[PDB]
């Protein structure tokens, strides 16, 4: 009953952000902050009232909250929302990152920031709708609707230093990748719906009804492949990753676009929620290909991150490597690896958010992103290099941060299933330590390699320090006490794992 408001509060808030700009140019940021705070408060209230820790695995479907409204009854299409533990964690993370994205764009007081905040809230509402929709048409609709404000934000509000043509090219490449892969997923959805209609005789896009769809081997493989192509584009999975460092490099310099609709792992959620339960046998046969794609993603992303001279592209390739770990975890069929994947998704969201916010602040201070033009920045800044050191320590999987808990539970479950892939992935952890130390030494240690890095720089303000330290506290708490997060997602992950291994 609150799930429609979880989607609608961002949309009404973005409309109010656009509408309240006539009252003043410092007004829409407050409207966006109240909007995202209300969304986060509703998500936290759903967390408190859900009783997820005491919920046991009863089998798919099992929803803690549900909402249904007819939308297109001709095709059996409904606004059908449902929340359980995994989607609840994703929605809470979306609300927190949306609050951080609003707070990070606080100083942008330009003449059209009402449209900026409207696009940000529309992206966040689309992401929440992706996490909530259990109607396949509605899920696809949210999946494709949240890319238009993404395109416009990158194209018009993006990196001001670069030429407009570069921003247009990166935005267009991202949009073509995501929307073409979404259309392939729509083809798979339509063919699954038609197979179900031929088997039974009713029109349904409901994910609960489409679970019990008898189909031959080969049809199921193709439907799985369409779903996986969409998810692999947005995860990213190599070689469908090239849009991501380009989109990150041309995103708005503060990084609200980075937090709002890139660092929320809708594709891993889609693989767990839709790909494994709808096509369990096809996913079981596809598992070696997906795991080797994850291994290639880990090492390729690590090597790409090391070779970068831009910090933003470096962090984007770190995202590629960590999503390779998550992709390995998803196809194991192990409960421990799935819980590690959930922890890894949340921790990677937090740590990459901290990294991107710190990079935006560093670019505000020194007006460049090339690491060859900096060095020795530890002696010139007050807070930024130490917090960057903490977050780089987090992305190499140091214990005490949630990233270690995530990928080590992933590797424990994966070794219980697939040992060779696991040992190669742990050498991927060595590669991760290499690229994190390389970025730290190129940016903040050594001597100044240009003139901008040789002078004292203004320190972080109270707001930026507050949000970075909140991310630090959350990452440390996830590293040392991950049990509430594991208890929240335990029932949903167990349902997905039991469905995957009991139908194969």
């Amino acid at each position: 009953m609150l799930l429609p408001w979880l989607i609608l509060i961002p949309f009404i808030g973005g409309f109010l952000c656009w509408q309240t700009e006539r009252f003043g140019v410092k007004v829409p940021r407050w409207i966006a902050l109240i909007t995202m705070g209300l969304t986060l408060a509703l998500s936290l209230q759903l967390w408190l009232q859900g009783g997820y820790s005491l919920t046991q695995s009863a089998g798919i479907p099992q929803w803690q909250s549900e909402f249904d409204m007819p939308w297109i009854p001709r095709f059996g299409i409904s606004i059908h929302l449902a929340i359980d533990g995994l989607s609840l964690l994703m929605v809470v993370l979306t609300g927190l990152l949306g609050v951080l994205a609003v707070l990070c764009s606080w100083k942008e007081i330009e003449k059209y920031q009402g449209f900026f905040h409207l696009n940000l809230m529309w992206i966040l509402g689309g992401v929440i709708g992706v996490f909530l929709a259990i109607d396949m048409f509605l899920f696809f609709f949210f999946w494709e609707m949240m890319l238009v404000p993404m395109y416009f934000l990158i194209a018009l509000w993006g990196h001001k230093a670069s030429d407009g043509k570069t921003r247009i090219t990166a935005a267009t490449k991202f949009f073509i990748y995501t929307q073409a892969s979404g259309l392939v997923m729509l083809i798979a959805i339509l063919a699954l719906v038609f197979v179900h209609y031929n088997a039974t005789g009713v029109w349904t896009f409901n994910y609960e009804e489409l679970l019990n769809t008898p189909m031959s081997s080969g049809v199921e493989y193709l439907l799985m492949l369409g779903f996986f192509i969409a998810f692999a584009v947005k995860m990213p999975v190599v070689p469908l990753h090239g849009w991501l460092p380009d989109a990150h490099s041309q995103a708005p310099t503060a990084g609200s676009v980075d937090l709002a609709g890139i660092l929320l792992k809708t594709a891993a959620y889609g693989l767990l929620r839709f790909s494994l339960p709808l096509f369990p046998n096809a996913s079981a046969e596809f598992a070696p290909i997906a795991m080797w794609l994850g291994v290639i993603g880990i090492f390729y992303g690590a090597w790409m991150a090391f070779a970068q001279t831009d910090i933003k592209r470096l962090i984007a390739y770190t995202s590629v490597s960590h999503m390779g770990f998550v992709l390995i975890a998803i196809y194991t069929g192990s409960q421990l690896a799935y819980q590690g994947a959930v922890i890894q998704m949340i921790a990677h969201g937090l740590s990459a958010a901290g990294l991107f916010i710190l990079c935006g602040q560093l670019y505000e201070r020194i007006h460049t992103r090339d690491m060859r033009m900096m060095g020795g920045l530890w002696s010139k800044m007050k807070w930024l290099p130490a917090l960057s050191l903490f977050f780089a320590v987090a992305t190499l999987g140091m214990p005490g941060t949630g990233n270690f808990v995530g990928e080590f539970m992933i590797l424990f479950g994966s070794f219980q299933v697939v040992p060779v892939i696991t040992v190669i992935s742990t050498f991927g952890l060595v590669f991760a330590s290499v690229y994190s130390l390389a970025m730290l030494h190129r940016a903040y240690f050594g001597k100044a390699k240009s003139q901008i890095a040789s002078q004292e720089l203004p320190g972080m303000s109270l707001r930026e320090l507050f949000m970075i330290l909140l991310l630090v506290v959350l990452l440390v708490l996830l590293g040392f006490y991950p049990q509430p997060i594991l208890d929240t997602s335990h029932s949903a992950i167990g349902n997905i794992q039991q469905w995957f291994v009991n139908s194969v």
Binding site: M409, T426, L429, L437, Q483
Partner: protein, 605 residues
């Protein structure tokens, strides 16, 4: 005894306070916070030891919370304290406290005073977590924390890029070791369903009654992690470069915390190694080979810090030899005594560096006993304990215990390697001492030096680690056998010291003749670069990594997926040639399409 978590919490609080102070506080306040956190940890450790001996050396378990709980995967945030844990905790807290007072004197007037003490406090907390953990994953938390603090402290002088390169190399090599340790953890959880040390030891012989292959793999990976942290073969290449940091960093790494973690890991999981005797023999062989190679490398080093680093590698090799011959008590005894005299030697070398200009070659200085006599005495008894001078040093008793344990179990070759290594140890130690301190001239820190001075004598050997009921007892030698073993070890050490005096005290004519000789120059170049292991790892791992990075820096997969875009551009440009604007061509294309449509309809009729 209930204050076991305070030994972690107080260094953690010190690290947090000194990190968030950000250098705003004065040097006295920062020194008070850091040194007092480590000192309160040491005082709590002393009270814990008194309580431990009060109830008859009973193992004390203090759980705090459950770290992870996913089905059968249960990892607890639980501390445990037995005799081995108490010995390691006492060594870490006490020696770290002495090093902290010496660093409070030493680092005065330096940039990042509070940052240095925050990093050393985090180092102390990480090592206390490592030695107090009751399961392998919490010990892995301490393992990685110790590695990270080592990386932060080696490259402490961050403005010099070579300090940062040394810190990065140390972190990367130790992380390879940590990956091997992670393999051991994965195998042990997959087999026994637990990572608790006592539970794994209990459940191992019933589970591995049919086959022992996975247990051998797990112990081999445990040894890989151990040699990663302890700088043994084949992961030993980071220590001599880790000399780039400040002197108390080297004292903490080489005496208290870092290099003893592998010895503690092998001694703690001694039951699983006892069910895999070939892997335990490999532990002993790795220790013997590492101590021989490290002694030969230390023989030809021209720097005091490099000599001390390879001497640390040799002494850790002695402890690994003791572990491999099932002399566990001797290994822990030598760990504690080596912590004492190696901390003394490193603090003395730092006083030498502070007194005589900047860091220098050993041949540049000479005749330094007259100018700086107290640190010369510190170097003298530190080298006497390192070289196992008989009946006056604790190192003699520790090395004698190791060699007696090797002889009693029939490991004659390992005992011979230990005797040869002791001869080379006396050789390189008094070569460095006689070159540096003999020849022609060219209270905050006195108290730790005095305490480590006393503990490097037989007073250090008077302390017995309470390893009753934790580690199995070594087989006792016959009285005549250990008598001639003691005489042989003392004779070998004294002969090595006398040969070093005959070779380096006076006019080094034979030494310079050997060094300038072509086989001598070749062997000296080979041993100076630590037998070419750094060169081999640079050619085998670093160079292809950098080559693949340079080859991939253009993102070839992105271009391969950009190929359809250029195909679409080319096809559109080709198709736009038909729109030439000519009406007669448009009519001709309509008639061509009519012909094609009609022919297709007649073909498929």
């Amino acid at each position: 005894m209930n204050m076991l978590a305070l030994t972690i919490i107080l260094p953690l609080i010190g690290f947090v306070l000194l990190a968030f102070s950000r250098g705003r506080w004065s040097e006295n306040v920062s020194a008070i916070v850091g040194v007092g956190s480590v000192g309160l940890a040491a005082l709590v450790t002393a009270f814990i030891g008194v309580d431990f001996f009060a109830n008859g050396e009973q193992t004390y378990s203090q759980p705090l919370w459950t770290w992870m709980s996913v089905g059968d995967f249960n990892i607890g945030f639980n501390l445990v304290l037995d005799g081995l844990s108490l010995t390691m905790l006492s060594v870490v807290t006490g020696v770290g406290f002495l090093i902290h007072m010496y660093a409070s004197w030493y680092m005065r007037g330096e940039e990042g005073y509070s940052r240095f003490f925050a990093y050393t406090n985090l180092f102390i907390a990480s090592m206390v977590v490592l030695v107090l953990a009751d399961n392998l994953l919490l010990m892995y938390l301490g393992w990685e924390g110790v590695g990270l603090c080592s990386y932060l402290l080696i490259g402490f002088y961050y403005t010099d890029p070579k300090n940062g390169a040394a810190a990065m190399k140390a972190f990367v090599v130790t992380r390879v070791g940590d990956v091997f340790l992670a393999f051991a953890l994965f195998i042990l959880y997959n087999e026994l369903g637990t990572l608790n040390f006592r539970e794994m030891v209990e459940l191992a012989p019933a589970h591995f009654a049919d086959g022992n292959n996975m247990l051998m793999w797990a112990t081999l990976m445990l040894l890989g992690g151990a040699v990663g942290k302890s700088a043994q073969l084949p992961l030993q290449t980071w220590l001599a470069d880790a000399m780039a940091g400040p002197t108390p960093v080297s004292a903490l790494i080489h005496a208290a915390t870092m290099v003893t973690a592998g010895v503690y890991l092998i001694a703690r999981t001694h039951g699983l190694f006892l069910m895999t005797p070939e892997v335990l023999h490999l532990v002993g062989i790795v220790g013997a080979v590492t101590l021989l190679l490290a002694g030969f490398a230390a023989l030809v080093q021209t720097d005091i810090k490099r000599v001390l680093a390879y001497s640390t590698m040799s002494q850790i090799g002695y402890m690994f030899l003791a572990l491999g011959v099932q002399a566990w008590d001797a290994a822990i005894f030598h760990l504690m005594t080596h912590a004492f005299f190696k901390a003394l030697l490193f603090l003395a070398s730092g006083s030498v560096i502070l007194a005589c200009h900047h860091e220098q070659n050993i041949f540049k200085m000479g005749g330094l006993r007259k100018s700086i006599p107290l640190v010369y005495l510190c170097f003298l008894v530190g080298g006497a304990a390192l070289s196992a001078l008989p009946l006056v040093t604790a190192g003699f008793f520790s090395k004698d215990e190791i060699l007696a344990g090797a002889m009693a179990n029939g490991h004659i070759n390992l005992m011979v390697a230990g005797l040869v290594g002791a001869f080379m140890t006396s050789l390189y130690t008094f070569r460095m001492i006689f070159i540096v301190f003999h020849g022609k001239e060219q209270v905050t820190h006195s108290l730790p030096l005095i305490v480590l001075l006393i503990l490097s004598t037989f007073v250090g050997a008077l302390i017995v680690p309470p390893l009753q009921g934790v580690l199995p007892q070594t087989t006792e030698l016959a009285h005549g056998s250990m008598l001639t073993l003691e005489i042989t070890s003392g004779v070998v050490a004294v002969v090595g010291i006398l040969l070093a005096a005959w070779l380096w005290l006076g006019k080094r004519t034979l030494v310079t003749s050997i060094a300038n000789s072509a086989p001598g120059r070749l062997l000296g170049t080979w041993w100076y670069n630590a037998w070419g292991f750094d060169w081999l790892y640079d050619k085998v791992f670093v160079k292809p990594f950098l080559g693949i990075a340079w080859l991939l820096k253009r993102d070839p997969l992105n271009s391969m997926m950009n190929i359809p875009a250029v195909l679409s551009r080319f096809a559109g440009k080709g198709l736009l040639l038909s729109e030439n604007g000519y009406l007669r061509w448009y009519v001709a294309s309509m008639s061509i399409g009519a012909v094609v449509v009609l022919a297709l309809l007649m073909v498929l009729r």
